[PDB]
Motif scaffolding. Structure first.
Motif, PDB file in Angstrom:
ATOM      1  N   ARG A   7       0.849  -1.318   0.205  1.00  0.00           N
ATOM      2  CA  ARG A   7      -0.138   0.178   0.101  1.00  0.00           C
ATOM      3  C   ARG A   7       1.054   1.286   0.147  1.00  0.00           C
ATOM      4  NH1 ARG A   7      -4.843   0.621   4.048  1.00  0.00           N
ATOM      5  NH2 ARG A   7      -2.904   0.810   5.278  1.00  0.00           N
ATOM      6  N   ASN A  12       0.597   5.611   0.497  1.00  0.00           N
ATOM      7  CA  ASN A  12      -0.397   6.447   1.020  1.00  0.00           C
ATOM      8  C   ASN A  12      -0.737   7.427   0.040  1.00  0.00           C
ATOM      9  OD1 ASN A  12       1.556   6.278   3.749  1.00  0.00           O
ATOM     10  ND2 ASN A  12      -0.556   5.805   4.024  1.00  0.00           N
ATOM     11  N   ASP A  62     -31.626  34.400  34.272  1.00  0.00           N
ATOM     12  CA  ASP A  62     -31.343  33.159  33.204  1.00  0.00           C
ATOM     13  C   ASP A  62     -32.957  32.529  33.145  1.00  0.00           C
ATOM     14  OD1 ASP A  62     -29.876  30.844  32.039  1.00  0.00           O
ATOM     15  OD2 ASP A  62     -31.059  29.854  33.436  1.00  0.00           O
ATOM     16  N   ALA A 107     -58.775   9.541  20.749  1.00  0.00           N
ATOM     17  CA  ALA A 107     -58.660   7.875  20.673  1.00  0.00           C
ATOM     18  C   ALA A 107     -59.951   7.102  21.147  1.00  0.00           C
ATOM     19  CB  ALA A 107     -57.646   7.560  21.762  1.00  0.00           C
ATOM     20  N   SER A 162     -25.494  25.012  32.630  1.00  0.00           N
ATOM     21  CA  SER A 162     -26.394  26.070  31.630  1.00  0.00           C
ATOM     22  C   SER A 162     -26.018  27.715  31.954  1.00  0.00           C
ATOM     23  CB  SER A 162     -27.810  25.886  31.517  1.00  0.00           C
ATOM     24  OG  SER A 162     -28.319  25.713  32.835  1.00  0.00           O
ATOM     25  N   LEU A 163     -26.482  27.895  32.971  1.00  0.00           N
ATOM     26  CA  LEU A 163     -26.112  29.225  33.487  1.00  0.00           C
ATOM     27  C   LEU A 163     -24.427  29.619  33.154  1.00  0.00           C
ATOM     28  CD1 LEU A 163     -25.833  32.185  34.641  1.00  0.00           C
ATOM     29  CD2 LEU A 163     -26.457  30.893  36.964  1.00  0.00           C
ATOM     30  N   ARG A 166     -23.914  30.428  29.393  1.00  0.00           N
ATOM     31  CA  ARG A 166     -24.471  31.366  28.975  1.00  0.00           C
ATOM     32  C   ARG A 166     -23.575  32.647  29.669  1.00  0.00           C
ATOM     33  NH1 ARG A 166     -30.514  31.891  26.958  1.00  0.00           N
ATOM     34  NH2 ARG A 166     -29.430  33.080  25.629  1.00  0.00           N
ATOM     35  N   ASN A 215      -6.677  16.085   3.032  1.00  0.00           N
ATOM     36  CA  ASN A 215      -6.864  15.329   1.829  1.00  0.00           C
ATOM     37  C   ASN A 215      -8.386  14.919   1.548  1.00  0.00           C
ATOM     38  OD1 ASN A 215      -3.355  14.326   1.218  1.00  0.00           O
ATOM     39  ND2 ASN A 215      -4.457  16.257   1.064  1.00  0.00           N
ATOM     40  N   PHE A 236     -55.197   6.803  15.456  1.00  0.00           N
ATOM     41  CA  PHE A 236     -55.407   7.125  16.752  1.00  0.00           C
ATOM     42  C   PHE A 236     -56.274   6.077  17.544  1.00  0.00           C
ATOM     43  CE2 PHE A 236     -54.668  11.074  14.819  1.00  0.00           C
ATOM     44  CZ  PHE A 236     -54.028  11.846  15.584  1.00  0.00           C
ATOM     45  N   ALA A 281      -5.490   2.877   9.434  1.00  0.00           N
ATOM     46  CA  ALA A 281      -4.192   2.705   9.390  1.00  0.00           C
ATOM     47  C   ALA A 281      -3.423   3.659   8.638  1.00  0.00           C
ATOM     48  CB  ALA A 281      -3.597   1.332   9.149  1.00  0.00           C
ATOM     49  N   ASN A 282      -2.274   4.601   9.140  1.00  0.00           N
ATOM     50  CA  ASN A 282      -1.868   5.617   8.228  1.00  0.00           C
ATOM     51  C   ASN A 282      -2.794   6.631   7.885  1.00  0.00           C
ATOM     52  OD1 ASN A 282       0.920   4.391   6.882  1.00  0.00           O
ATOM     53  ND2 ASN A 282      -0.427   2.787   7.618  1.00  0.00           N
ATOM     54  N   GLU A 326     -49.089   6.234  23.578  1.00  0.00           N
ATOM     55  CA  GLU A 326     -50.267   5.628  24.204  1.00  0.00           C
ATOM     56  C   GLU A 326     -51.474   5.739  23.426  1.00  0.00           C
ATOM     57  OE1 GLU A 326     -50.817   7.163  28.162  1.00  0.00           O
ATOM     58  OE2 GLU A 326     -50.799   9.204  27.491  1.00  0.00           O
ATOM     59  N   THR A 327     -51.525   6.843  22.730  1.00  0.00           N
ATOM     60  CA  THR A 327     -53.032   7.433  21.838  1.00  0.00           C
ATOM     61  C   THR A 327     -52.774   7.468  20.486  1.00  0.00           C
ATOM     62  OG1 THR A 327     -52.156   9.622  22.256  1.00  0.00           O
ATOM     63  CG2 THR A 327     -53.592   8.672  23.742  1.00  0.00           C
TER      64      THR A 327
END
Lengths: 158, 50, 772, 51
Positions: A28, A30, B4, B29, C48-49, C52, C113, C142, C201-202, C245-246
């Motif tokens: 092979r 490259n 927040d 349903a 989260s806070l 932000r 590449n 439904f 590989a490589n 369920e519905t």
């Protein structure tokens, strides 16, 4: 394996200046790119690179004593003008198994005045009409094609 | 914290939508038919005294 | 390079310090893990806070410095701040930057590449997308869906493995220089390791990410979820968009990533081997183990051993349970009784024999438990939650959806608890011929009654009639079951409640060891019979595809192809290490010796005598060309060595090398008689029989670090032998010692002589002697 | 009913038309290959010839 280790293995302490043959099949490379070759190889007279996922010819150094090449099973396409400068003394070439679409890609090979035989099998070009003749008319120096000369003259062993 | 959370007051849409579609899918349903537009337009919900 | 020198200088500086020297010197390498935790310890209450709040800042991303300079990323493209020279306090090797930088990098930065490698990294998610593209969505409806809470799997996975096996896969596909000593799994499954290795590989990649993604690739995500309809991994991955369920979003998903046919085939094979190995009364168990070990089956591309597949599988079925018992695999707390499923929620008991007269006076003993005992049950499209008490069925609550299945479940449950008069006074029809010893083995009463009910519907109706019938009181009409499994009736079976909605399946993450008797009766550290051979389909004929029953008794081929296959096995048996063998002769270029090996002499008679000479000339020629140059294909050598026994002659070579049985081998192209592939170079397919080749010497295609691992072995430490590289292992002489770094912090001594005899056989033989 | 229709939004089934296409550039190659003589012959059967 890999062209680097494969080559370093084939070279059992031998300098890269006294060899007459080399083989790199089932390895092979490259990027489908040669790696590890240089102009140090001068006495080289044969080369074989088969099924190495190759796609182009760009890192090829200059090799004068080279007189036979094999690139089967790869997907090379387009690069065929380097041969007129690196291997002008080349006679036998083979490309069966590569990506070749039109003839314009083949035209540069006319400058290889030393060309004798060429091998194109399983390429898209082969699926054309009156292709052997058009190629022969393009490369007059040529005599053998895919192992067969004009009139379907089977070539000898070697 | 108030900053927040206020900047996230948009949560109310989720809860209200869930309750409304919890009522509409349940009502649809029991009859095995698309009854959403009829439920939305018709179903009366007590909202006060006058 | 210079980087190496930098690493060495850094190590030197570290050792010059005193504390670092102490911590490195003392103990083993595992301490690293510990040290990996005392550092970088910092969490946050409300992420989260914090995020932000941070993002408002000019530079909220730490980043590398040298990579930015190299990539010619300036601080400001156009009056927009991106980063400023500074050092992050904690890392001390990073510089603050802003998020805008990513956009710039994304739009004009350095381009690689090819990025198609990501499709291999996340093969699971691309598989998800490909499967989703083939779903023909029909129509939302439904209705009140009946959902049962049960454990399932939510990821279609091929070749599911354990955590221990997977860990080597990551090491042997990415970090080979630091791979641990070769395990059994790596040697057995070398086609998978090669296939994964080639892709990664490589390549420029973050290796850790790929390893983690392969971990998720080989993990079937098991979850305890509400479920409706069929149970298939292809659905459970997107069940959220199929129904609730519905509502129900109908869709046809049958033909995507079929994973049920291989489970079905595995169970069929286990049934076949269990039914085969009942002939030997005295030694059924040993025959069963040998039968399992000498069998394999194809999964996708690779061929896997049945023994490992059974260990990995989770099919809680009577067929697999016995086989898992014989091998020693631990299994779930799940009982069986015919084609039924059970799960003991609570209770206890103890065996108590009672007589049953079969006809007139014929005493037959049967054992019955004596305590209260609740049991979940599961027959096709029906479920129950029954309870027993001292040889009486106290109650049964069913929540199924079919009448026939309901009746069958009720009958098999009644039988389970040996309730009813019939157990006291057997039915007139049943006779002593069927009572026991169909093949010389006694059949207890309960299984006799089970066969009776299966034989004819009338017996089933009589059994249900045995349970008292009363008049449906008012109100309870809905919670009643007639003889035809009616939802309501005027008269109904005594204490047989009926409801709507499947009974939720219990759950328990327990593993119980269970043995098996000479008669294949699986005991589980207590009287209970979890499974037996008298709860399997009687028999059936099937044509198994891509399977290997490499055992004499379990074979249908004739003596000819068997003889050829045996000869090729023998020829591959001389491929082991040591002098006077194929690899050593090839190294010494002594091709001539190959023509006089014993196995070729044994195999020569088969060769077609009319043209033996001509074939011998061609195959004797090819080997030399392969041998002398140093470029050879081991498989072709093995294929064509049988012909090198006889004297060459003259003649025309058509192209095929025949035997005396009209079967040939063409030199180069794979065919049925002899096949192989460059992908899996460790298998030879002779007439659809898998012959493992040992890994003692590499070949041009197969050449890699793995193809030699079997040849080497450990030996007594000798400090005189040299210390070599992993790659140089190929060049070492046979029967030569060498020291070698292995894994992490292990220096060992390896001798290139294959000594891995079967461990199971020796232990079994020696242990049997202890009983004489 | 009318409510059923208004609910499902039923509308006539629009008839699709085949999209127009351009000049085939490969018909010539196919034609030329058809003018070639293959290695094998006699694919088609024919009857016999009376007296």
């Amino acid at each position: 394996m890999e062209m680097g280790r494969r080559i370093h293995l084939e070279l059992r302490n031998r300098t890269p200046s006294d060899v007459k043959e080399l083989v790199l099949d089932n390895s092979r490379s490259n990027e489908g790119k040669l790696e590890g070759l240089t102009d140090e190889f001068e006495e080289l007279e044969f080369l074989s690179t088969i099924n190495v996922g190759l796609t182009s010819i760009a890192n090829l150094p200059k090799l004068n004593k080279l007189k036979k090449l094999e690139l089967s099973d790869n997907r090379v396409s387009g690069g065929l003008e380097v041969l007129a400068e690196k291997c002008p003394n080349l006679t036998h070439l083979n490309l069966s198994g590569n990506k070749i679409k039109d003839l314009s890609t083949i035209e540069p090979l006319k400058k290889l005045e030393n060309l004798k035989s060429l091998d194109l099998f399983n390429c898209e070009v082969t699926n054309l009409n009156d292709y052997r003749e058009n190629v022969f008319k393009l490369l007059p120096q040529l005599t053998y094609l895919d192992g067969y000369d004009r009139d379907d003259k089977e070539a000898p062993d070697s | 914290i108030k900053n927040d959370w206020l900047s996230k007051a948009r949560r109310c849409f989720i809860t209200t939508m869930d309750t409304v579609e919890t009522i509409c899918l349940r009502e649809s349903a029991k009859a095995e038919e698309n009854l959403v537009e009829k439920t939305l337009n018709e179903k009366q919900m007590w909202i006060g005294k006058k | 390079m210079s980087l190496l020198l930098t690493i060495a200088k850094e190590y030197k500086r570290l050792c010059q310090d005193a504390k670092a020297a102490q911590m490195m010197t003392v103990g083993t390498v595992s301490n690293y893990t510990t040290f990996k935790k005392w550092t970088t310890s910092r969490k946050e209450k409300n992420p989260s806070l914090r995020m932000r709040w941070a993002m408002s800042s000019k530079f909220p991303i730490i980043a590398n410095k040298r990579m930015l300079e190299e990539a010619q990323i300036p601080k400001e493209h156009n009056n927009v701040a991106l980063w400023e020279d500074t050092e992050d306090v904690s890392k001390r090797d990073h510089v603050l930057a802003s998020a805008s930088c990513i956009n710039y990098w994304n739009f004009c930065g350095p381009c690689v590449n090819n990025s198609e490698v990501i499709k291999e990294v996340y093969k699971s998610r691309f598989g998800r997308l490909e499967r989703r593209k083939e779903i023909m969505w029909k129509e939302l409806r439904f209705t009140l869906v009946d959902r049962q809470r049960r454990r399932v799997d939510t990821q279609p996975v091929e070749q599911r493995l354990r955590t221990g096996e997977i860990k080597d896969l990551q090491m042997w596909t990415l970090f080979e220089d630091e791979a641990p000593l070769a395990s059994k799994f790596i040697l057995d499954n070398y086609g998978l390791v090669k296939e994964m290795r080639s892709k990664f590989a490589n390549k420029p990649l973050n290796k850790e990410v790929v390893a983690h993604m392969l971990e998720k690739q080989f993990n079937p995500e098991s979850r305890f979820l509400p479920v409706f309809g069929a149970i298939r991994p292809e659905r459970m991955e997107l069940i959220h968009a199929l129904g609730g369920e519905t509502w129900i979003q109908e869709a046809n998903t049958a033909g995507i990533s079929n994973v049920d046919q291989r489970k079905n085939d595995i169970r069929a094979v286990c049934r076949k081997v269990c039914l085969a190995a009942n002939a030997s009364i005295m030694n059924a168990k040993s025959k069963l183990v040998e039968y399992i070990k000498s069998t394999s089956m194809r999964i996708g591309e690779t061929e896997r051993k049945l023994e490992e597949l059974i260990l990995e599988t989770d099919d809680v079925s009577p067929e697999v349970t016995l086989c898992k018992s014989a091998l020693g695999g631990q299994l779930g707390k799940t009982l069986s009784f015919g084609p039924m499923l059970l799960k003991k929620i609570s209770g206890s008991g103890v065996k108590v024999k009672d007589t049953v007269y079969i006809q007139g006076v014929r005493a037959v003993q049967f054992e019955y438990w004596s305590e209260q005992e609740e049991f979940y049950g599961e027959y096709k499209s029906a479920t129950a939650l029954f309870s027993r008490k001292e040889r009486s069925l106290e109650w049964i609550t069913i929540g199924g959806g079919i009448n026939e299945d309901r009746k069958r479940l009720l009958a098999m449950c009644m039988i389970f608890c040996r309730d009813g008069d019939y157990f006291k006074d057997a039915p007139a029809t049943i006779t002593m011929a069927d009572l026991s010893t169909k093949l010389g083995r006694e059949i207890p009463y309960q299984y006799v009654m089970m066969n009776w009910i299966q034989k004819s519907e009338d017996n089933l109706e009589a059994l249900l009639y045995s349970r008292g019938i009363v008049e449906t009181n008012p109100g309870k009409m809905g919670s009643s079951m007639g003889i035809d499994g009616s939802k309501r009736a005027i008269k109904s079976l005594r204490a047989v409640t009926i409801q709507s909605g499947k009974i939720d399946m219990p759950e328990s993450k327990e593993k119980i060891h269970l043995e098996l008797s000479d008669n294949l009766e699986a005991f589980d550290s207590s009287g209970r019979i979890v499974a037996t051979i008298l709860d399997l389909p009687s028999d059936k004929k099937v044509t198994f595809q891509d399977v290997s029953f490499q055992h004499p008794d379990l074979a249908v081929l004739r003596d000819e192809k068997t003889a050829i296959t045996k000869g090729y096995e023998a020829l591959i048996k001389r491929l082991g290490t040591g002098d006077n063998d194929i690899p050593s002769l090839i190294a010494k270029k002594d091709y001539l010796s190959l023509y006089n090996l014993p196995e070729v002499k044994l195999m020569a008679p088969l060769i077609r005598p009319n043209r033996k000479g001509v074939y011998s000339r061609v195959a004797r020629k090819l080997v030399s060309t392969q041998v002398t140059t140093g470029h050879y294909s081991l498989h072709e050598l093995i294929k064509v060595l049988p012909f090198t026994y006889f004297a060459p002659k003259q003649g025309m070579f058509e192209g095929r090398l025949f035997f005396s049985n009209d079967s040939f081998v063409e030199p180069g192209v794979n065919n049925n008689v002899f096949s192989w592939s460059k992908a899996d170079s460790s298998k030879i397919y002779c007439h659809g029989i898998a012959i493992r080749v040992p890994l003692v010497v590499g070949d041009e295609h197969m050449d890699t670090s793995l193809a030699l691992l079997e040849g080497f072995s450990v030996c007594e430490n000798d400090p005189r032998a040299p210390m070599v590289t992993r790659q140089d292992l190929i060049d070492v002489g046979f029967g030569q010692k060498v020291r070698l770094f292995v894994g992490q912090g292990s220096v060992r001594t390896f001798k290139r002589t294959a000594s891995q005899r079967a461990a199971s056989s020796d232990v079994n033989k020696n242990v049997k002697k202890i009983k004489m | 009913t009318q409510d059923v229709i208004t609910t499902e939004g039923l509308k006539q089934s629009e008839n699709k038309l085949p999209e127009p296409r351009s000049f085939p550039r490969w018909f010539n190659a196919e034609w030329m290959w058809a003018i070639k003589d293959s290695d094998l012959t006699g694919w088609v059967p024919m009857a016999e010839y009376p007296p």
